[PDB]
Amino acid sequence: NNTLWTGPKPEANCIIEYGKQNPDSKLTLILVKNGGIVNGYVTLMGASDYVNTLFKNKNVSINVELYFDATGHILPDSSSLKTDLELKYKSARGFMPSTTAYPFVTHNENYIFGQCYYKASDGALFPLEVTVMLNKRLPDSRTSYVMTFLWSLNAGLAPETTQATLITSPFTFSYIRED
Amino acid sequence: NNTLWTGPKPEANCIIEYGKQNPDSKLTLILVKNGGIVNGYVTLMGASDYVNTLFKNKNVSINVELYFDATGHILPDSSSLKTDLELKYKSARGFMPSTTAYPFVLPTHNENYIFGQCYYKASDGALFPLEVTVMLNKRLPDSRTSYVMTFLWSLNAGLAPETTQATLITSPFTFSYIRED
Amino acid sequence: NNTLWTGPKPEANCIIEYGKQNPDSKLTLILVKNGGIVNGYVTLMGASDYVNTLFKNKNVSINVELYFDATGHILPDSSSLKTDLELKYSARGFMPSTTAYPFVTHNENYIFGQCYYKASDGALFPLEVTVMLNKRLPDSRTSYVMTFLWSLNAGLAPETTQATLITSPFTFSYIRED
């Protein structure tokens, strides 16, 4: 096995409104080992009312954070994914980003930038700037690996007037893993 | 063996201009299985006159369909790639896009799309940005097929990228999707 | 063995100061086999005064050229990498294909991407990267050619001071040789 799943069509497991106590958005995140790197797949689907009424605004920054431990499981008390990451065919430290090439500490060799697109309901296409930040920080003492995701959007015209569902284009990226 | 080929530089197999039986373009399509996903590699090359005279305009769109079958081969009667795909060291059910993550709908739906950007280097060295809209299943042509994978290259430029005829070669586009076990 | 490293965090092994004999800039280049293709990871960090003071200017074109021989060991005399790649534990399979990217117009030897530069206060400047595969020949003993070109034109300067030239990790995928 070399695939850290989340689910091909998972239920609600991620919170976006910071302060809720029931999960309200689905997050699809697939990591695969490939030689000396890890390839990634990540998308986010809003499955509530407030997240679906996010893109009536013109400047929106969506943050999703993940805090693994030394073994490599999500601590759901302090993370932002409220469901553990499971394998496919069966210790899961092999999919986590390296603390040799992205050390803890300025020091902007940690970030990985990129883009996705939001397909609006009136046929419009808007670009979302994705910032994937690696380790960079320690929120706790028991936290051993950090991986955060950010979807930034600034637009002149407003993207949506009525509420539609929130759906982003998939994102693909690669990072150096811990052995 | 985990590579669905088309050829590193094959002959003319794809067809644009629906209403024609001559294969008028070349299409390198490589789908590599990797863990629980499939990585890809798409390159469209011009191989006739009609594909090469497309970029004398400015708002153009090049469409390619791939309608698979129930077991993982390409139906040539309905798709636009009239040449079956092969392995590297010769059933291809493993390389098909997943129906539990990209499900079939019937009346909008926008969770089974892939967006990307490639570039067209013109005859004098000017990069033009083309948009790629890789659409997975989303629809069904008829009852024979079981999976749908379409590609689409759009360009809305400001001026004409060419005036004479040159070989329309696009930059290689890379993408990834979830496969059907 | 399916990885051509550079080290996870190396010392300086490239030369951008045009006319120096010692290396002055580090770059991480990782190539991995994956079926019929090879995935690639590349980033470039400056390590001297001239490389760090490149981005006080508007237009900057950084050029890194690699010339693999018949086997695949990098010639450290005519390339820009002054230190060859190593395996994780020959190296013909990681080199690009010749029946897909042939030598000599012929605009099929290119892969165009995009990366970013985080500025001194941080402003996300877009660098346009161009990976030219083989297309050329220095002499009759190099067999494979790769070239990365990091181009930047900008409205204003990225930074008015010297900080560090750290570019974003760029990812690509090419057809490999058997």
Place this chain on the structure above:
Amino acid sequence: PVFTQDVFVGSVEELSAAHTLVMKINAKISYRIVSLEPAYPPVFYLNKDTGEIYTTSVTLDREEHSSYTLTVEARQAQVQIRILDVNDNIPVVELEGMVENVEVTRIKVFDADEIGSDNWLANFTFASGNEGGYFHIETDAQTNEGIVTLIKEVLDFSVIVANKAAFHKSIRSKYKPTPIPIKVKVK
């Protein structure tokens, strides 16, 4: 059920990232925002145990609203948060002068930031044409006007316009400097 003060104040940066500390109100107490005067976006999230107002996943804009007055109950009071403007909104220019130290032209511009501050003042540089040394600049701050004055008595030139301070981290690496021409006549 009892507060400590009556009128709270605070300051949050314009176009800041999510989850930043705005202010820390005080009065187990479950802090409860009940109303905003601009009410349609929820821009502020109140941590219920500690009274720390945070900026949630939707970000602000000073040019739509500069003062948020929200009423909060601690189980009544006011909260009056002001927005500090950062320098987005590149200036725009709405230009002929004839001579015979006589001032030549008057250049009127239009910014969009806080009026009076150093993110509003148009600072005028030189682009192509003052190598003869003919024009010295002056930024009339009280009405934001680009006065020029003669240097060497006796041709056209151009001006690149920017703000007084440096731009924000978002609008930089998009600002393309476009030169603007001035035609000077001589008798």
Place this chain on the structure above:
Amino acid sequence: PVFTQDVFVGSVEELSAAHTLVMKINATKISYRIVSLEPAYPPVFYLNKDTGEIYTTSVTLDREEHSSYTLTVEARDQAQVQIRILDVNDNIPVVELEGMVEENQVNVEVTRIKVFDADEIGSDNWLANFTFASGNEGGYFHIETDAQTNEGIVTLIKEVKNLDFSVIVANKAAFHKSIRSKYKPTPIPIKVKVK
């Protein structure tokens, strides 16, 4: 040791690729070294100390910010180099209308459109070319570029109501690869009334 000339006049083009050959200076074992440039703060040129060649380097050039360079070299066991930057086409001509015609007038002037192109004055990269968009279908107006101060003067053809139209701007020579696929044609219109 000694040199063979005193003014090695050569040239290179604006916005060129890195490590193009500017010129090859010469002297009658020798080693070459630049001792001064005219601008001290941008290092733009590189002196090949083996064969006496001038290359451009990883930071490329712009003619509009500094037009001509003068730089002094000196060889060991001085002389001046005078490099003029050849201008290539770049940034789009920008446009800043009304006019009046009369009954059955032939070849009369309506407007003289001004245009500020930031390129080299006199060459083919500053001379604007004005093409029509919509309104000159039936053979109404003709356009010429007066090359004294780059004026897109229009004139009548036939003998003639609110027949307004629009013009599209371009240079006389075609654009570079670094500015094309960003040039979007914005036709700024022209209003004209008959009397």
